[PDB]
Design a protein around this nucleic acid. Structure first.
Ligand SMILES: [Cl-]
Ligand SMILES: [Cl-]
Ligand SMILES: [Cl-]
Ligand SMILES: [Cl-]
Ligand SMILES: [Mn+2]
Ligand SMILES: [Mn+2]
Ligand SMILES: [Mn+2]
Ligand SMILES: [Mn+2]
Ligand SMILES: [Mn+2]
Ligand SMILES: [Mn+2]
Ligand SMILES: [Mn+2]
Ligand SMILES: [Mn+2]
Ligand SMILES: [Mn+2]
Ligand SMILES: [Mn+2]
Ligand SMILES: [Mn+2]
Lengths: 84, 99, 108, 95, 97, 78, 93, 104
DNA sequence: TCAATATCCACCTGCAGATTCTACCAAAAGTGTATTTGGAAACTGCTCCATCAAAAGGCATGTTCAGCTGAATTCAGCTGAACATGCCTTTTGATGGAGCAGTTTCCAAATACACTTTTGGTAGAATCTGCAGGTGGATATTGAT
DNA sequence: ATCAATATCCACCTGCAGATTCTACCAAAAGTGTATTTGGAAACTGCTCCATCAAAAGGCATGTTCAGCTGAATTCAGCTGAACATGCCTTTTGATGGAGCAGTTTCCAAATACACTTTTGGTAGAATCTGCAGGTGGATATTGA
């Protein structure tokens, strides 16, 4: 297939700004965007890791939404809406 | 004239706006691509249910949106109105995330 | 023989008592499960969902819609102090956030 | 032949009609409502499971489900939950 | 006479108290406080000697922890003096308030 | 009673907390928090007590309460 | 009557790492609280892991995954190591 | 002739098995799970006790006390995380003072 | 920089509250046997995940340009620290006593089983419909003058 | 206070994805007769909470004095927001192939049940120690001059 790199930059400045808006943020310093990407990277890494752990223990090659839900659960980030 | 709004007027406009909606703010593909990148750096030859990638985005945006809320408080508490990395870090520290 | 009659009806409930009883046994919570247990539980469950659908349904009314959606669910939960506390660490997919803008941010 | 999977949709819908006879619910909203029920069911059954263990009791009775409810739900929500709970039980038992 | 500059003893007290582990709230008063609040939930209760100590331990830990995040906030505001607004902010980011 | 928790003790707590200067309003603000903490914990402990049909709050009751509040404590049977 | 705890085992293990060191009463308490806690966390996750996977039994397979999921990176490796080791050895004899 | 000795463990395999069995976790319990779990418990215990012993030594003490267990944990990144939401009675806190608070 | 005032840090010391160490008795834990049955292969049915192609226009990029926000500085009054005083509450210890957390039985009511019929639910089908997207128009909000 | 420039808020429209209602099996509730416990119900101990008393010992409450910290004001360099031109990619649709979940059967290795048979772990006394808590004495760390 194709090689994946620097995809974190897929999280555009525009998008991070939109998110801060919903968070009710009026003014955004130039250094926020990269911090944000940092924080997002970590958040995703931790959730995908536990998710995949669940997937492997199921002896599956496909990460299911439930895997992600249990993952989020462990992180104390319970999500409603994908109960399967 | 030409016409142009004073700095901040559009921002507040954008806030009022995005707080009324419930759509995702990160583009679908760029984000799916980011998940696949991270995932395969943990285990290879993986596959994802359409919904898993969506459950992840719902989670991430929900997380970030909430972190910015807290960050916004720290800025304000600092007699500022512009959020800075300082704030995001104070937030996460108190949150007990990356203390 | 006697005509079948559901436990839910005996209890005067909408939620499935028998199903809840099954879930408790299969759930590995305790060796044995009493009879009132699934009844009291199905009851509480039915009351809580009733409490939120009422509030959600109103949220729907206010946005001129007649079909409840997630945002309506979020508005109901985030505005009612108690439900908010009860689900203070739950995140509702597609629910957005409550419109709220800090005062200091407004034009002076 | 796809195996059948249960949910609480049927019951949520019934209750919905009782409160707002005129109102509907999108499938995504029912998605959430299902998560809600499963969530609270687990929270309660869990504390009940735990509560029985502590009291060297091998069975979970409505008295367990009740303390569980008082511990997990806040103020008023607990007050009404407890009534409804009790009420339902006594009715059930009382023939 | 001989006086120490303001904050000199404060720092000294910090260094001392961060070193030790003894409870810092006087026992009896606490005992009394616990029992009072408890009385509003159930009357004529009895408190296991250890149960009270557990609470004081849990409680004093909690506060010391909260004074930490509070101090972090005060500093973030270019201050060196914690104020109620700092506790409020801390408890809010913590999700307690 | 809450007034039983004195300024000096609150000072000491803040001290172990690394706090150097204290606004005069902290003390009263602190009692408020301190009160809510016990109310929440105690209230649950007592609930555990009654379910046990006991009249004596036990350390294990406090421990289990502290766990429900996400304040897990080591040293009293758990 | 009877009131079991891990005091002994903690102590035995203490002597291997520090045959010279002792341990206060309260300190032993902290150690029991510690074991019971972790015991509960792992057993807990293992319980869930088997349910998600509709299994009637909790095996080392579950406990191991449970450890990956609960313990921090390096700690998890060794835990996983020590674990599989004890089983292997136990199985041999 | 006990499973613990057979597994080469100092922790009670038999007891862990009996607990897993009585704790309403699953209907059936594997033969190896008690062993594995017992190994994990023992390992983590050793880890705490060692660091704790070192903490005791550094204080010029032969007997470990709560303080030493707190000093061992809050000082080890990993243990600290594994117990970030646990409070050790009688453990106090790590000495630490914000720079901006120092003199001159 | 000196000279004085508390602080702190060592070393050694000795009683004593806890630790260890010493001896035993019942709940557990280890054996043998006889069953049971969970869930690992070996297959196959068949969702639905990864890919592709292609056209379109919603948005992401990058520039300009200057409003106004964050960040130094300065400065004064007034809050909060350091302290010497002095009295009151908390800390410490037996003492008894009464409440009550535990156990020992009892067994009657309640739950678990086994298995035999009944239906409420779930999965599609066929039948409906709230409303997403579009629009034009009456307002409303901003910002220059 | 206009008032010209833009962004918003609303009601009217209407075909179509989705939400509902209609149907046909079939897992899984409900029934009914048995077998097995669970755990609530008096009585009856120890054992720890509670009270009381009774000192001293600190430790906390007060009032002074002023050091230095926190805001309030000013000022200004330049960062970050608003508007705009350009055209890149993400978004949408629709079509497949085939990797892999999943539903079925088959059925040994492995776990449950049981009846006994042996430990080992938890107690309740007897036999030492690690340190706290003091006591100098000696440099330190602070401060004022
Ligand atoms: Cl910063
Ligand atoms: Cl019951
Ligand atoms: Cl304040
Ligand atoms: Cl196993
Ligand atoms: Mn109604
Ligand atoms: Mn089978
Ligand atoms: Mn471009
Ligand atoms: Mn300029
Ligand atoms: Mn400014
Ligand atoms: Mn001055
Ligand atoms: Mn029917
Ligand atoms: Mn519309
Ligand atoms: Mn294949
Ligand atoms: Mn022995
Ligand atoms: Mn000493």
């Amino acid at each position: 297939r194709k090689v994946l790199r620097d995809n974190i930059q897929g999280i555009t400045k525009p998008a991070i700004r939109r998110l801060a808006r919903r968070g009710g943020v009026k003014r955004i310093s130039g250094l926020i965007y990269e911090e944000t990407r940092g924080v997002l990277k970590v958040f995703l890494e931790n959730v995908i890791r536990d998710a995949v752990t669940y997937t492997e223990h199921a002896k599956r090659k496909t990460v299911t939404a439930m895997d992600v839900v249990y993952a989020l659960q462990r992180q104390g980030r319970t999500l409603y809406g994908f109960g399967g | 004239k030409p016409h142009r709004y004073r700095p901040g007027t559009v921002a507040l406009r954008e806030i009022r706006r995005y707080q009324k909606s419930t759509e995702l703010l990160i583009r679908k593909l760029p984000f799916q691509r980011l998940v696949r990148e991270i995932a395969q750096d943990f285990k290879t030859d993986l596959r994802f249910q359409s919904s898993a990638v969506m459950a992840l985005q719902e989670a991430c945006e929900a997380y970030l949106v909430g972190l910015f809320e807290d960050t916004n408080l720290c800025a304000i508490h600092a007699k500022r109105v512009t959020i800075m990395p300082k704030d995001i870090q104070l937030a996460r520290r108190i949150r007990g995330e990356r203390a | 023989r006697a005509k079948a009659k559901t436990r839910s009806s005996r209890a005067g409930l909408q939620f499935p008592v028998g199903r809840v009883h099954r879930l408790l046994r299969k759930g590995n919570y305790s060796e044995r499960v009493g009879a009132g247990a699934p009844v009291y539980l199905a009851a509480v469950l039915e009351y809580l969902t009733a409490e939120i659908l009422e509030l959600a349904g109103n949220a729907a009314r206010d946005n001129k819609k007649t079909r409840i959606i997630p945002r309506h669910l979020q508005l109901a939960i985030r505005n009612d102090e108690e439900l908010n506390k009860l689900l203070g660490r739950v995140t509702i997919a597609q629910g957005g956030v409550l419109p709220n803008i800090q005062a200091v941010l407004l034009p002076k | 032949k796809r195996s059948r999977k249960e949910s609480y949709s049927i019951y949520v819908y019934k209750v919905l009609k009782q409160v707002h006879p005129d109102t509907g619910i999108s499938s995504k909203a029912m998605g959430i409502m299902n998560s809600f029920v499963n969530d609270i069911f687990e929270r309660i059954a869990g504390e009940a499971s735990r509560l029985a263990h502590y009291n060297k009791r091998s069975t979970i009775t409505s008295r367990e489900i009740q303390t569980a409810v008082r511990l997990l739900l806040p103020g008023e929500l607990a007050k009404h939950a407890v009534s409804e709970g009790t009420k339902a039980v006594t009715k059930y038992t009382s023939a």
